[PDB]
Amino acid sequence: MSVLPFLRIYAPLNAVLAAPGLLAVAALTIPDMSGRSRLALAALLAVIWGAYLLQLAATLLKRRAGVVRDRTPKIAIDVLAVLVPLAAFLLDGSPDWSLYCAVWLLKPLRDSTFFPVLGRVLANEARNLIGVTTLFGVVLFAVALAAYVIERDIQPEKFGSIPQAMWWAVVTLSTTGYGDTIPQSFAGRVLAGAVMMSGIGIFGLWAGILATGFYQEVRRGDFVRNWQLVAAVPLFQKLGPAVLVEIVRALRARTVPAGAVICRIGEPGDRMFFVVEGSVSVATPNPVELGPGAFFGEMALISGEPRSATVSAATTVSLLSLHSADFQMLCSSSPEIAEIFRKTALERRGAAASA
Amino acid sequence: MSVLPFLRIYAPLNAVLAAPGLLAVAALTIPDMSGRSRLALAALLAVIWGAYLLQLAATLLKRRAGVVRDRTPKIAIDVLAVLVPLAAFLLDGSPDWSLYCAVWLLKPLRDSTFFPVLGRVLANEARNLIGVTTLFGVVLFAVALAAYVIERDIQPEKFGSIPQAMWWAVVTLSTTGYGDTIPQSFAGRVLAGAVMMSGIGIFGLWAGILATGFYQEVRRGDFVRNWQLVAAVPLFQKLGPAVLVEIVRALRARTVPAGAVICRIGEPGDRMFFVVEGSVSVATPNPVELGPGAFFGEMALISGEPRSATVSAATTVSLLSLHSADFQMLCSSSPEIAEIFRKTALERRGAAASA
Amino acid sequence: MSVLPFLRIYAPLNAVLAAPGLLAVAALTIPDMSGRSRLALAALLAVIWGAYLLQLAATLLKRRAGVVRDRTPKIAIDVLAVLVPLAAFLLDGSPDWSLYCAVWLLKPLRDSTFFPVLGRVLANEARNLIGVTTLFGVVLFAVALAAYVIERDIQPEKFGSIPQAMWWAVVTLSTTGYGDTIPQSFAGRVLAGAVMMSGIGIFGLWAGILATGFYQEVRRGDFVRNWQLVAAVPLFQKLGPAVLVEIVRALRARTVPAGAVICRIGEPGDRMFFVVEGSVSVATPNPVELGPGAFFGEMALISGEPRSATVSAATTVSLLSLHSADFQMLCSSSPEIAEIFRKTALERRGAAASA
Amino acid sequence: MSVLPFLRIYAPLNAVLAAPGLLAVAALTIPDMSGRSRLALAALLAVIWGAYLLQLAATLLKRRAGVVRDRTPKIAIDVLAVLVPLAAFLLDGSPDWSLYCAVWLLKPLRDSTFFPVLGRVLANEARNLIGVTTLFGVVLFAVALAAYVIERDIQPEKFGSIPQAMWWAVVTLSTTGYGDTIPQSFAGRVLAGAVMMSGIGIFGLWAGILATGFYQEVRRGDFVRNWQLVAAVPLFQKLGPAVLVEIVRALRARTVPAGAVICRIGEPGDRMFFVVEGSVSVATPNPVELGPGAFFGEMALISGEPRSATVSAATTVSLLSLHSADFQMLCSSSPEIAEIFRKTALERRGAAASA
Ligand SMILES: [K+]
Ligand SMILES: [K+]
């Protein structure tokens, strides 16, 4: 709610082209298709092949910044991103070689930050997941077995065994309801009453396990990144030790591209920013372009008013941001700083129009 | 649990009439329907047309309070709320012009506060949603592909391609279970075991992403609105800086209409209120009508008793409210204020019956 | 995890008998049923009728404690619990009068505490629910309409209208998957990709709205009840103001019936209790029966050991309970109290066997 | 996200063999199966029988550490793990005796820690679950009844009774959507609009009840275990009382097996560890093998750098772990300790290469 995400967060053309790349698959996969456009997109594989292949050797020129680097992840696919189609091209002379369009699917995941964040936590909590997944397997066959007890007699053809029943378990437990083969008797129909009751508590926990400390990591992700951009601010010599842990949970950083709008004038004042690197376009008769290491919005927050300036991203600014309460929290937290921000609430009145 | 929501929170007749307005659609949509009531409701479009159109020009008289205003949102539909039916009326001479009853559907959303609240946060967290939505597309085709591997042989007519399989993926992943086309082999049936396991963790996160800091915004929504109605209370010169952040998370404000009941006498005392604007009906031999900037309930909370007065909303009172713990928290937080509330617990014993 | 719930929490025979009472319905509801047991259970209605009717007039003798009472809720059904069957008995001379076995269903809800707790909060947060429920109706018809656009042509018989499509919306949105009528074209099949994506975020919020501050109320429910049983403890003259808010969130009270086990000897020490009313059976050569206002378990917690006594509920004891951390929190919170609990960890060594 | 789970957390071969053990069931369960491998796995039951039976008497030699022990849980199945197959072997002379492969299913649960953790909390919160489960039964028949009102007329064969309707309730309420028998009329089709709306709020709460304070227990599980491994650290004479409660929520302990990697050199520094028991392989010219009661990583965290040593688990080390913020929290929390860790950030520069 308090952040300006811009500059094409889904930027890298490596990440982009699997999507157009892999829809190229389908038309090959289909009868009654002319050959015209059939192979026309086979090029587009060759394009994406050649395109990543173009990118490829530039990467293999890894004498760049070659001091200490851990790039087994980033490289893992780039190798295979061209080889797997290639060996596929020949031995699988038949068109099915395109079935090695399973391959680029990691390329989005190549430069997918927030995926390490995902896999980071599973290697702390899977202890639970196992004891639950076991427990999932407990309750599965514990309950799956209860059906073969019954309808083997009059429904062999659907329930003539155990695993045919295990099928109808998790379909029944995991919230799904396919609807292919269903009981006819009473007591077997009774048993479902605990099933959804169970599974929705099972996943009531188990999916909750994920979001539980995932969010801890994500809410932690906004600190590990943001104990940086702290010392850069020239004011933070005075802040006490414990004060920051309160703060950085709320302070998110993002980056705006050049030209874009930051705060348009006259819009309702609802937040303030801490610039740390880049520069701005504070639209005044004399533009007060504050570069790395500044802020604005206090003129509107202390007064509770619209914007005092059409600030626009003159350059690519690594931004921060902040809503009132957390700034009121700061204003509440210390008279030492409200003094200068009060002065600033008068200086920037006289500094906005002036130089 | 601690608030009195009254005065028709779904008030504005602009917001109201799409519901009766759009059910007017259906009878046109249906064969074997007489023409009698068919067009009878076509009027009701004309009514709602004329009705908003009546409202319309009053809005276009936007010389009202014309100083600095940002009304592109509120106006966006009012323009189209009449034009789109209108141009539809002529070029679509055929009855299908009523299919521009897709149009009013924003009119509820026109004056839908809590919808900006919704859209506010997506422009902070969609970073995740993308990396997840990509990941959703990863796991989709990653898994969808695994089926065409198999049943293309014996189920062409259902699984004779890739996208027919992508269909059966999210139907299978997204908790649904349609039940149109289902495997017959083993290993393809095996694969589902991870699917629901996955998707319920996927949405185990992804839907959780929404409620995660949505609630932060909503729990923030009760501060940004309620750092107001703070200075109005004549007592709050003494409160310390940090004290309020604890409080305002709990203090919700609402507004009661005139005439309505606030606290009926003899009901079990469970909460107290801070009036800030309006007036009351404190039912005593001399009604102690406390207007803007007062409170009551302490007589019942400190004593832990039923109500001392049938207080009723004499006027439209912008209300606050408060449960005990948070007032006990305050009573715990300072002896400075319990003194006067103790005195008040004796003054209002003598002030209730007296003037 | 830290509480002993006993004494038949589903106690009241008023609450009990709807369950046996209403299963009495079914056998009447069924063809090919002999008349023998048919009416045999009609008695059981008459029993439950007579039984509550027996209870009834005792309630209508409401001169008991008749000072100030708010009993419209408790009485609302007891009136109807006998009348509705009664008038049903005659005018509905046909057996369908038993269809006024819809009636007792509130009787469990009559003496269902935790149901007021439910309905308490909806009158604070339904503001959201409306803006969401509207939004649910937005996204419903916003999306439902998109289908009649298409398959009216080739699927009139299933999609020959709007509301037939609204049907397939929430079935599709609300996680369900019935599986009666399904598209055949592409673009209409495309649209589902956002649907489950939506609804699982919708209810991703909306159901979350419930558990959100429900839990606040429930976690509040353990304070409003438990600022009581505080002064009774003879030790709590010294505790500081803010200290308790930390505590009472964790301290749950329950009540054990006479005879039952409290802590059996030799079991692993994992918790301690604060008795406030009732008496115990501390199994020692001289039973140290501590009555209202005492505690035990510190001998095992400070030492981290099994139990020092087979304590059993000699009477109906209104119990508290407590795990270590929260007691370590207290031991951490003050040296003033660990002294006496250290002494107690030696006194009760000498007081256990002795008198 | 901050922990190294290793040494075969799913270790015990007792726990292992039900999985291979119980899949042995299926081939017996199936027609058209040769007898060759049929009984070949009957051995594997005899193996697992004999194998646990081998383990068994070693357990029944419970003179080991025979002072005070509470082993009714661990023993409960080991008794039956061999008897139930055994008596099954004879009286059920027919092959169905293998249906006492329902029996080992507790054997995973035998040595399933985190299962007591599960069952611990249900005996605090089931108060709710009942009032909800009742409420589930309320809303069930409250709503189930509403259908027999209607389609008994034209759908006897599907809705010719009450319980046939109760079937279609929870299938409809519990998020499932089987799709066997569906209405045809309007008002009965209307009713579903509240159903999913309800059940997803029902389980919106009810499943949430589980994860609610489950997580409290789990987040508590990391304290009850970890107030241990506290005094062992020679430094913790100075820490203040309240300081630890902040900490131990974050500090998880796990155990690494011998040989395994702990921190490989040059990897990005992201965490530090507290060793308390075992020994390490700090790969330096003179290996600084710190045994029970030490730490490392500060050299990389204060500097924010890659690893200073390929530390590997020389022995089975009962590990702790810690990320930066929580260490920054400590560094923020006191100058008393950053001094020595600063010194350590120079000592271990000179102590790493040296002895
Ligand atoms: K479903
Ligand atoms: K289905």
The string of DSSP codes covering C51-112 is HHHHHHHHHH---TT-SS---HHHHHHHHHHHHHHHHHHHHT-SGGGGGGGSSTTHHHHHT-
Method: cryo-EM
Q: Are residues A134 and A229 located together in one domain of the fold?
A: yes
| DSSP classification of residue B257 | P
Residues C245, C335: Cα–Cα separation, whole Å: 19
Domain extent, residue D95, equals: 11-125
Structure-token match 């407590």, residue found: C322
The number of angstroms, rounded, from the C-alpha of B5 to the middle of its chain's C-alpha atoms is 13
Q: Are residues D33 and D87 located together in one domain of the fold?
A: yes
Nearest 5°: CA angle at B90, between B87 and B92?
90
Q: Are residues C46 and C109 located together in one domain of the fold?
A: yes
Q: Which residue from A22, C189, A107 is spatially nearest to B169, judged by alpha carbons? A: C189
Are the beta carbons of C269 and C297 closer than 8 angstroms? Answer: yes
Give, in order, the Cα–Cα distances in Å from A112 to each of A210, B125, B134, B147. Answer: 19, 16, 9, 26
Report the SS3 class of residue D221.
Answer: helix
Residues C117, C230: Cα–Cα separation, whole Å: 23
Q: Which residue from B259, B275, B232, B252 is spatially nearest to B314, judged by alpha carbons? A: B259
Q: Which residue from C94, A180, D41 is spatially nearest to B177, judged by alpha carbons? A: A180
Residues B163, D33: Cα–Cα separation, whole Å: 37
Query: Is the minimum CB–CB distance between C14 and chain D shorter than 8 Å?
Result: no
| DSSP classification of residue D257 | P
β A317-320/A271-277 pair status? antiparallel
Asked if C177 lies within 8 A of A175 by C-beta distance, the reply is no
The number of angstroms, rounded, from the C-alpha of C52 to the middle of its chain's C-alpha atoms is 24
**Helices B186-224 and C186-224 meet at what angle, rounded to 10?**
60
For chain D, first and last CA: distance in Å? 33
Residues D242, D232: Cα–Cα separation, whole Å: 19
Give, for D317, the enclosing helix (H) or strand (E): strand D317-320
Residues D59, D77: Cα–Cα separation, whole Å: 12
Which string of DSSP letters, residue by residue, matches D141-185? Answer: HHHHHHHHHHHTTT-HHHHSSSHHHHHHHHHHHTT----SS---S
Q: Which residue from B202, B204, B127 is spatially nearest to B169, judged by alpha carbons? A: B202
In this complex, the chains that touch A, judged by 3 or more CB pairs closer than 8 A, are B, C, D
Return phi, psi of residue C277, to 5°.
Answer: -160, 130
- Amino acid identity for residue A136 in this structure: F
Q: Which residue from C321, C328, C300 is spatially nearest to D245, judged by alpha carbons? A: C328
Q: Hey, what are C107's tokens?
A: 């009787």
Most C CBs within 10 A among D205, D209, D218, D243, hence the mutation to make, goes to: D205
Query: Is the minimum CB–CB distance between C340 and chain B shorter than 8 Å?
Result: no
Report the SS3 class of residue B183.
Answer: coil
Residues D160, C31: Cα–Cα separation, whole Å: 9
Are the beta carbons of B68 and B44 closer than 8 angstroms? Answer: no
Instruction: Find chain A residues with C-beta within 8 A of D175's C-beta.
Output: 175, 196, 200
> C119: how many CB neighbours lie within 10 A of its CB?
9
β C310-312/C281-283 pair status? antiparallel
Q: Which residues pair with C274 in a beta bridge?
A: C295
Structure-token match 């609802």, residue found: A270
Residues B8, A103: Cα–Cα separation, whole Å: 57
Structure-token match 């995740």, residue found: B128
**Rounded (10°) CA dihedral B15, B18, B19, B23:** 180
Instruction: Find chain D residues with C-beta within 8 A of A200's C-beta.
Output: 174-175, 203, 206-207
- Amino acid identity for residue B40 in this structure: A
Q: Are residues B111 and B131 located together in one domain of the fold?
A: no
Q: Are residues A110 and A153 located together in one domain of the fold?
A: no
> C227: how many CB neighbours lie within 10 A of its CB?
15
Query: Is the minimum CB–CB distance between C124 and chain B shorter than 8 Å?
Result: yes
Q: Are residues B45 and B64 located together in one domain of the fold?
A: yes
Q: Which residue from C257, C236, C259, C258 is spatially nearest to C248, judged by alpha carbons? A: C236
The number of angstroms, rounded, from the C-alpha of D84 to the middle of its chain's C-alpha atoms is 28
Q: Are residues B83 and B172 located together in one domain of the fold?
A: no
For chain C, first and last CA: distance in Å? 33
Which spans in C180-320 are helix H?
A: 186-224, 243-248, 298-301
**B to D CB pairs, distance under 8 Å:** 7
Give, in order, the Cα–Cα distances in Å from B267 to each of A28, B300, C72. Answer: 74, 10, 11
Q: Which residues pair with B119 in a beta bridge?
A: none
Q: Which long-range contacts (CB under 8 A, 24 or more apart) does B96-103 make?
A: B98/B25, B98/B28, B98/B42, B98/B45, B99/C145, B101/B21, B101/B22, B101/B24, B101/B25, B101/B45, B102/C142, B102/C145, B103/B77
Are the beta carbons of D112 and A134 closer than 8 angstroms? Answer: yes
| DSSP classification of residue C306 | B
Return phi, psi of residue D213, to 5°.
Answer: -115, -5
Residues D170, A190: Cα–Cα separation, whole Å: 12
**Rounded (10°) CA dihedral C82, C85, C90, C95:** -160
Give, in order, the Cα–Cα distances in Å from D209 to each of C114, D203, D213. Answer: 14, 9, 7
> A11: how many CB neighbours lie within 10 A of its CB?
10
Q: Are residues D116 and D222 located together in one domain of the fold?
A: no
For chain A, first and last CA: distance in Å? 33
Residues B355, B284: Cα–Cα separation, whole Å: 9
Most D CBs within 10 A among A141, A185, A206, hence the mutation to make, goes to: A141
Q: Which residues have CB atoms below 5 A from the ion given as ligand 1?
A: A 176-177; B 176-177; C 176-177; D 176-177
Q: Which residues contact C203 (CB under 8 A, 6 or more apart)?
A: B207, C174, C175, D200, D201, D204
Resolution of this entry in Å? Answer: 4.5
CA-atom Rg of chain D in angstroms: 29
Residues D176, A176: Cα–Cα separation, whole Å: 5
| DSSP classification of residue C40 | H
Are the beta carbons of A286 and A225 closer than 8 angstroms? Answer: no
- Is the dihedral angle over the CA atoms D65, D67, D73, D77 positive or is it negative? positive
Structure-token match 């709503």, residue found: D143
**C-alpha count within 13 angstroms, C-beta hemisphere, residue D79:** 6
Return phi, psi of residue A288, to 5°.
Answer: -85, 80
Q: Are residues B115 and B131 located together in one domain of the fold?
A: no
Return phi, psi of residue A275, to 5°.
Answer: -75, 140
**B143 CA from centroid of ligand 1 (Å):** 19
| Residues composing chain A | 355
CATH at residue B152 = 1.10.287.70
Q: Hey, what are D41's tokens?
A: 């796995």
Residues D314, D291: Cα–Cα separation, whole Å: 10
- Is the dihedral angle over the CA atoms D124, D127, D130, D131 positive or is it negative? negative
- Strand order of the β-sheet with D310-312 is D261-263, D310-312, D281-283
Q: Are residues A67 and A108 located together in one domain of the fold?
A: yes
Q: Hey, what are C346's tokens?
A: 């030696």
Q: Hey, what are B346's tokens?
A: 């004796």
Q: Hey, what are C282's tokens?
A: 């501390």
Residues D272, D308: Cα–Cα separation, whole Å: 12
**Helices D163-173 and D115-151 meet at what angle, rounded to 10?**
130
Query: Is the minimum CB–CB distance between D216 and chain A shorter than 8 Å?
Result: no
Give, in order, the Cα–Cα distances in Å from C191 to each of B42, C180, C186, D276. Answer: 30, 18, 9, 57
Q: Hey, what are A119's tokens?
A: 């896999």
**C178 CA from centroid of ligand 1 (Å):** 8
Q: Hey, what are C125's tokens?
A: 């947060």
The C-alpha of A78 sits at a distance from chain D's nearest C-alpha, in angstroms, of 21
Query: Is the minimum CB–CB distance between C175 and chain A shorter than 8 Å?
Result: yes
| DSSP classification of residue A35 | S
Which ligand sits closest to the CA of C200? Answer: 1
Q: Which long-range contacts (CB under 8 A, 24 or more apart) does C80-87 make?
A: C81/C49, C81/C52, C81/C53, C81/C56, C81/C107, C82/C49, C82/C52, C82/C53, C82/C56, C85/C45, C85/C49
Which ligand sits closest to the CA of D178? Answer: 2
Residues B86, B275: Cα–Cα separation, whole Å: 48
Structure-token match 């000498």, residue found: C350
Asked if A176 lies within 8 A of C177 by C-beta distance, the reply is yes
Q: Hey, what are C319's tokens?
A: 């119990």
Are the beta carbons of A185 and A159 closer than 8 angstroms? Answer: no
Query: Any known ligand binding at B298?
Result: yes
Q: Hey, what are A112's tokens?
A: 């997918």
Q: Which residue from D203, D207, D195 is spatially nearest to D168, judged by alpha carbons? A: D195
Nearest-by-Cβ selection for B200 from A171, A207, A324: A207
Which spans in A152-309 are helix H?
A: 156-159, 163-173, 186-224, 243-248, 298-301
Q: Are residues D32 and D132 located together in one domain of the fold?
A: no
Which ligand sits closest to the CA of D171? Answer: 1
Q: Are residues A88 and A136 located together in one domain of the fold?
A: no
Give, for D343, the enclosing helix (H) or strand (E): helix D335-353
Instruction: Find chain C residues with C-beta within 8 A of B268's C-beta.
Output: 70
CA-atom Rg of chain A in angstroms: 29
**Rounded (10°) CA dihedral A231, A232, A234, A237:** 0
Longest Cα–Cα distance of chain C, Å, equals 92
Q: Hey, what are C243's tokens?
A: 């200290």
- Amino acid identity for residue D123 in this structure: A
Q: Hey, what are B208's tokens?
A: 């959780």
Which string of DSSP letters, residue by residue, matches A243-280? Answer: HHHHHHTT--EEEEPTT-EEE-TTSBP-EEEEEEES--
Are the beta carbons of C342 and C316 closer than 8 angstroms? Answer: no
**C178 CA from centroid of ligand 2 (Å):** 4
Q: Which residue from B157, B146, B192 is spatially nearest to B172, judged by alpha carbons? A: B192
Are the beta carbons of C149 and C162 closer than 8 angstroms? Answer: no
Q: Which long-range contacts (CB under 8 A, 24 or more apart) does D98-104 make?
A: D98/D25, D98/D28, D98/D42, D98/D45, D99/A145, D101/D21, D101/D22, D101/D24, D101/D25, D101/D45, D102/A142, D102/A145, D103/D77, D104/D17, D104/D18, D104/D21, D104/D22, D104/D48
Are the beta carbons of B124 and A252 closer than 8 angstroms? Answer: yes
For chain B, first and last CA: distance in Å? 33
**In chain B, where do the E strands start and end?**
253-256, 261-263, 271-277, 281-283, 294-296, 310-312, 317-320, 322-323
Residue of B nearest to D180 (CA): B179
Give, for C317, the enclosing helix (H) or strand (E): strand C317-320
Which spans in chain A are helix H?
A: 13-16, 18-23, 36-40, 42-60, 72-91, 106-110, 115-151, 156-159, 163-173, 186-224, 243-248, 298-301, 324-333, 335-353
Return phi, psi of residue C310, to 5°.
Answer: -75, 85
Query: Is the minimum CB–CB distance between B176 and chain D shorter than 8 Å?
Result: yes
Residues C313, C296: Cα–Cα separation, whole Å: 13
Give, in order, the Cα–Cα distances in Å from D254 to each of A10, A123, B349, D4, D274. Answer: 37, 11, 63, 6, 11
Are the beta carbons of C311 and C282 closer than 8 angstroms? Answer: yes
Residues D114, C183: Cα–Cα separation, whole Å: 46
Nearest-by-Cβ selection for B223 from A115, A208, A325: A325
Asked if B177 lies within 8 A of D175 by C-beta distance, the reply is no
Q: Which residues pair with C295 in a beta bridge?
A: C274
Q: Which residues contact B303 (CB under 8 A, 6 or more apart)?
A: B269, B345
**D174 CA from centroid of ligand 1 (Å):** 8
Q: Which residues contact A170 (CB under 8 A, 6 or more apart)?
A: A140, A176, A199, B192, B193, B196
Report the SS3 class of residue B302.
Answer: coil
Residues C240, C242: Cα–Cα separation, whole Å: 6
